[PDB]
Structure 1
Amino acid sequence: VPPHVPFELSGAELRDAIVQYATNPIYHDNLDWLNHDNPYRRQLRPQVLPHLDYDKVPGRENILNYASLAVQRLLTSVYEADLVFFPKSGLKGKEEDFRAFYSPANRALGERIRPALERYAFGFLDDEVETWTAQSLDAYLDSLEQSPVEKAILGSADRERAARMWLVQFAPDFLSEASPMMRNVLGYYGPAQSEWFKVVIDEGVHDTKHSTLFERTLESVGLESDLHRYWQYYLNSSLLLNNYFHYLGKNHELFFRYVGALYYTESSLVDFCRRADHLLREVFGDTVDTTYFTEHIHIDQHHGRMAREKIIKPLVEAHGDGIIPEIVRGIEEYRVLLEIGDFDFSEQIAWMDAQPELKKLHDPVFEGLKQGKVDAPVAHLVEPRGELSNTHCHDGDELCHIVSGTMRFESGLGSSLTLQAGEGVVIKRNRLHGANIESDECVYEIHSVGDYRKCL
C-alpha cells in the first residue's frame, strides 16, 4: 500500500485554485444591479481574488472585511451546486449557463477549495465558543425587548425601504426552505432519521410549500422571488448564516451541531414569526402578505419539543455523552452568528439612511486631507459609461471624490446618490456599496483615510 499523502492546499496554489473556480464566465461582474431570472449567475468579483490572503484566518473583529464577504459569496455558490434551480421563465435560452453551473468541472473546482473556504469563513468560531453529562445538558437547555432589527427598521428614515432590504436577506434561505436540513436525511441511521424527515416534510403540496408562501410575501411588497435577483444586496452576515447550515448539513462530522442548532431554531421560531408578522404589518399595512410567518404564530406551531425528546434524547443514549458538547456548540455558534447579523444589518440600514449627510461630509473630509490631517493613499480611476462596480466593501473608511463626470453611488436596495464633479461621499468601513458610471466618462479618486473622523 503506497503511503497516504495528506490533503494539502495553501498559499499560491490555493489562490490559483480559488481563481480557477471563480473565473467561470457565469461568475463575472454583472452589467446591471440585478440578476434577471437567471439562477446560474452569481457575482464573485474574480478580478479581486488573486490579491486576498486565504491562509490568514480572520477573527471576529475582522469577519465583515472584504475578504470575508468574498469568501461567503464563493461558499454560497459552492454549496448551491448541490441544489436544483430552474428559471421562473423556464430553461429555454439559459441552457449554456445551466451547463456551466452544473458541470463536473464547476463542482470539482469548488469542492477542492471548500475546506480552505470553510476554515476562512468559520474558523473564528473556535475562539468565540468554548466534558459534559446528560444531567448538565438538561439544565443548559432549560436555561435558554425590542430586537435590533425592529429598532433598525422602525426607526429608519425610510421604513418600507429598510423592511424590503431585510426581506431580500432571506431569499436564499426561505425560497430554498429546508434544503440544508434535507442533507441530514440521506443515509441509514436510527429512529432519529425519521424524526429529522418529519421536520423537513413540514417545511408535497406546492401552494402550501413554505417557499411559495415567502414568494407571496416578497411579491406583496413589490419584490421578486427569482433566485438570486438581489445577489448584490445580500449582506456578508446573511450569507454567513445561510452558509453555516449548509456547512453543518454537508459535513456529517458536524451532525450533532446541527441537532443543537435545530433545537434552538425551532424553540425560537414562534417568537421570530410573531415579531416578523407584527413588524411587517406596521410598516406596510394591509397590503403585505405575512402568511409565511402566520403559519407559525400559534404557540405549538414548531418542532422544538419533538427535537428534544425524539432527537436529542435518543442520540445521547445511543452515541454517548461525548456528543453533548457538539450539540451545545451548534447552539452557541448559531447564537454568535445571529449577533453578527443583527449588527451588520443595523449598520447597513444606518449607512443607507445617512447617505445625504455622508455626501455632505465629503467636503470637510476632503479639506482635512488637503490640510494633511491624514496622509491617505489615493487610487486614481477613470471609467467609461456603464462600468458597473459590483457591490463590495473596504476594510477602512474611504473617501470617494469625483473630478469629472457623473456617478450613481449605490449603498443598498433603493439607496442611491448621484455624484457630480467636485462632489463625493464618505464610504464607511465594511458597508456594502457599488457604483455605475452615468456620463461618457467619469474621473474619480478613492482616498484610503482609515478613520474618516481623523480628517474632521
Structure 2
Amino acid sequence: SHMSHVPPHVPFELSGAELRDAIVQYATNPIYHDNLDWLNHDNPYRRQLRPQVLPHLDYDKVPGRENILNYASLAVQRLLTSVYEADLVFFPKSGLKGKEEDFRAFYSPANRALGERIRPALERYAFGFLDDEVGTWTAQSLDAYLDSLEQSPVEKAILGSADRERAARMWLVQFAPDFLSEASPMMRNVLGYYGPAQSEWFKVVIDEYGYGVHDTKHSTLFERTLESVGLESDLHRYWQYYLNSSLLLNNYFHYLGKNHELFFRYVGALYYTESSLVDFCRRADHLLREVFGDTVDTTYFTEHIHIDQHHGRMAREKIIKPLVEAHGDGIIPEIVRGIEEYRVLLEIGDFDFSEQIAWMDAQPELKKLHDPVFEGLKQGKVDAPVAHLVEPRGELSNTHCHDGDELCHIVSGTMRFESGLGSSLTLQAGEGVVIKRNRLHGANIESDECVYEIHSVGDYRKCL
C-alpha cells in the first residue's frame, strides 16, 4: 500500500573514467613506483606497477585470448597479484627493522580498500576471456570425464636453449610467488564451516605445510632449490622478470580461493593439479638435474612425487564425491569449468615462456637484424611512427612489453637492453635491436646521456 521503508539497493557499479581513476588511485601508493634497479632487495612490500601508464589503458574493453599477452593484460596481472597479496603475511628475510614504513603502506586500510574496490573490474579484465574458451551433468558423466583425463613444451624450450642454465633459472623464478607461499591460495578455502569436505581439504593443506615443521614446509624446500642454482628466495626479488602468464596462473588460484562462489571451480582444479603434479614434478626433477648436474636440490619436486599420488585420490574420493552428494549435480559444471579453465591457462603459460626464451636467446641476432630493419624503414617499406628520446645515466625503464614490434635505434650513448634474467645487450651509437611484440623487456642508460629512437613498425618482417 506504501513504499518500502528500506532504501532501494543501488547496484555496485564502477566503470569508465571513474574506474580508471580508482585504479590510478590504488597504484600511485609510493611502494608501487618504478624501481631504480632490476631487483627488489629483500623488500616484500615493493611491487612495480608502472603507475604512470595506467591512466592510458582502457579497462572496460575486455581482451579475448589472442590479446591477453598485450601490455594492458600484464599491467592488470601485476595489479591483481598486489591486491591478492595484501591478504598474505610477509616479512623481509633480514627482519622488519628499517622497513616498517613500507610494511605500513602495504598493510593499510586504504591500500586494501582501494585494491578491493577495483578487484571486480580487474578480474573481468584478467579472466573474462575464459568465458569464450571453455550444460547439465550427472555424477555418472563426471566420473567418465575424470577417468578420461613426449617432451613437454617447457622441456623443449629449456633443453634446446642457447643457454640451458639461464633458461632454467628464468623458469624457476616464475614459480617464486606460487611456491614460496605454497598452498596459501588453497588455505583460503578451509576458513569457515562446511561439511567433512573441509577437513579433507585441510589434510591436503597440512602436507603442503610440511606438517607444521619449517624444515619440511614445501616453500622451504623450494628456497633450497632456488639457492642451489644461485638464485635468491626473498619475495619479490625477481618481480620484473615475472612473465604475464606466470602471474595469470598464480592469480587464477587466488581468484578461485577468494571468491567462494567459485569454490566448486577450485575443487575441480584441485583434483586436476594434484593428480598432474606427479608427472610435472618427475619431469622437473629430471630436467633440472640434466641442466645443472648434481649441485641442484630437487627435493621440492621429488617430495611431491611421493605425496601427490595420494592427494589426487583424496580430491576425487573425499572432496568431489561427498560434495556432489551433498549439494547435487548442479555443482558439476563448475567442477568441470575449473579443470578446463586451468588447462587453458597452462597452454598460455607454455606459449608465453617458450616465446620469452626464444626471444632471450635470439638477442645477438636481433641486434644484427636492426640493420636491415632500419634500412627498410629509411626506404619507406613501412610508415612507422617514430619517437625521439633523451635520457640520463641510470634512467631505468622497468620491464614491460608492447603490442606491436618496435625498432630501437641508438644515436648517441650506451644502453643496457634487458630481455630476461641473465639476458642483456649493450647497445652503442649506431646500434639497436628489433623488439618483438608481447616480449618482456626494459632498459637502463649506462652512458651519461643516451639519445635514441623508437620506431613503431608493427610487424618487423614488413621492413625486410
Q: Same fold (TM over 0.5)?
A: yes
Deviation of the 1:298 alpha carbon = 3.7
SS of alignment partner, residue 389 of structure 1: strand
Q: 1:82 to 1:300 in 2, by over 3 A?
A: closer
Per-residue CA shift, 1:287-341, capped at 9, x if unaligned?
0000000102348644011111111011011101000000000000000000000
Per-residue CA shift, 1:142-187, capped at 9, x if unaligned?
1101000000000000000000000000000000000000000000
Provide the residue aligned with 2:328 in structure 1: 320
Provide the residue aligned with 1:77 in structure 2: 82
Per-residue CA shift, 1:392-435, capped at 9, x if unaligned?
00000000001111000000000000001110000000000000
2:277–2:308 Cα contact (<8 Å) kept: no
Cα distance in 2 for residues equivalent to 1:239 and 1:179: 15
Identical counterparts, % of pairs: 100
Query: TM-score normalized by structure 1?
Result: 0.99
Query: TM-score normalized by structure 2?
Result: 0.98
The answer to whether structure 1 residue 311 and structure 2 residue 323 are counterparts is: no
Deviation of the 1:193 alpha carbon = 0.2
SS of alignment partner, residue 453 of structure 2: strand
Per-residue CA shift, 1:204-262, capped at 9, x if unaligned?
10000010000000000000000000000000000000000000000000000000000
Deviation of the 1:379 alpha carbon = 1.2
Q: 1:310 to 1:299 in 2, by over 3 A?
A: closer
The answer to whether structure 1 residue 193 and structure 2 residue 201 are counterparts is: no
1:40–1:98 Cα contact (<8 Å) kept: yes
2:274–2:308 Cα contact (<8 Å) kept: no
Deviation of the 1:380 alpha carbon = 1.1
Cα distance in 2 for residues equivalent to 1:302 and 1:34: 38
Deviates more, 1:128-137 or 1:59-68: 128-137
Q: 1:299 to 1:42 in 2, by over 3 A?
A: closer
SS of alignment partner, residue 308 of structure 2: coil
Q: 1:376 to 1:130 in 2, by over 3 A?
A: farther
1:269–1:302 Cα contact (<8 Å) kept: no
The answer to whether structure 1 residue 47 and structure 2 residue 55 are counterparts is: no
Deviation of the 1:42 alpha carbon = 0.1
Deviation of the 1:39 alpha carbon = 0.1
Q: 1:191 to 1:351 in 2, by over 3 A?
A: same
1:132–1:324 Cα contact (<8 Å) kept: yes
1:39–1:226 Cα contact (<8 Å) kept: yes
2:135–2:333 Cα contact (<8 Å) kept: no
Q: 1:277 to 1:424 in 2, by over 3 A?
A: same
2:26–2:114 Cα contact (<8 Å) kept: yes
1:296–1:302 Cα contact (<8 Å) kept: no
Deviation of the 1:381 alpha carbon = 0.9
Provide the residue aligned with 1:220 in structure 2: 228
The answer to whether structure 1 residue 158 and structure 2 residue 163 are counterparts is: yes
Provide the residue aligned with 1:400 in structure 2: 408
Provide the residue aligned with 2:353 in structure 1: 345
Deviation of the 1:130 alpha carbon = 8.2
| Structure 2 residues without counterparts, runs of 5 or longer | 1-5
SS of alignment partner, residue 442 of structure 2: strand
Per-residue CA shift, 1:8-62, capped at 9, x if unaligned?
0000000000000000000000000000000000000000000000000000000
Provide the residue aligned with 2:275 in structure 1: 267
1:301 paired residue among 293, 309, 312: 309
Cα distance in 2 for residues equivalent to 1:399 and 1:198: 54
1:295–1:301 Cα contact (<8 Å) kept: no
SS of alignment partner, residue 342 of structure 1: helix
Q: 1:154 to 1:443 in 2, by over 3 A?
A: same
Deviation of the 1:138 alpha carbon = 0.6
2:275–2:309 Cα contact (<8 Å) kept: no
Cα distance in 1 for residues equivalent to 2:304 and 2:310: 7
Deviation of the 1:80 alpha carbon = 0.1
SS of alignment partner, residue 278 of structure 2: helix
Cα distance in 2 for residues equivalent to 1:321 and 1:61: 33
Provide the residue aligned with 1:365 in structure 2: 373
Cα distance in 1 for residues equivalent to 2:25 and 2:287: 44
Cα distance in 1 for residues equivalent to 2:174 and 2:310: 22
Give the root-mean-square deviation of aligned CA atoms. Answer: 0.8
SS of alignment partner, residue 184 of structure 1: helix
| Structure 1 residues without counterparts, runs of 5 or longer | none
1:270–1:302 Cα contact (<8 Å) kept: no
Deviates more, 1:296-305 or 1:130-139: 296-305
Deviates more, 1:101-110 or 1:298-307: 298-307
1:81–1:107 Cα contact (<8 Å) kept: yes
SS of alignment partner, residue 232 of structure 2: coil
Provide the residue aligned with 2:3 in structure 1: none
SS of alignment partner, residue 426 of structure 1: strand
2:403–2:437 Cα contact (<8 Å) kept: yes
Cα distance in 2 for residues equivalent to 1:338 and 1:130: 24
SS of alignment partner, residue 416 of structure 2: strand
Runs of 4+ in 1 over 2 A off after TM superposition: 296-302
Per-residue CA shift, 1:94-119, capped at 9, x if unaligned?
00000000000000000000000000
Q: 1:337 to 1:447 in 2, by over 3 A?
A: same
Q: 1:300 to 1:202 in 2, by over 3 A?
A: closer
Cα distance in 2 for residues equivalent to 1:223 and 1:304: 31
2:275–2:308 Cα contact (<8 Å) kept: no
1:379–1:447 Cα contact (<8 Å) kept: yes
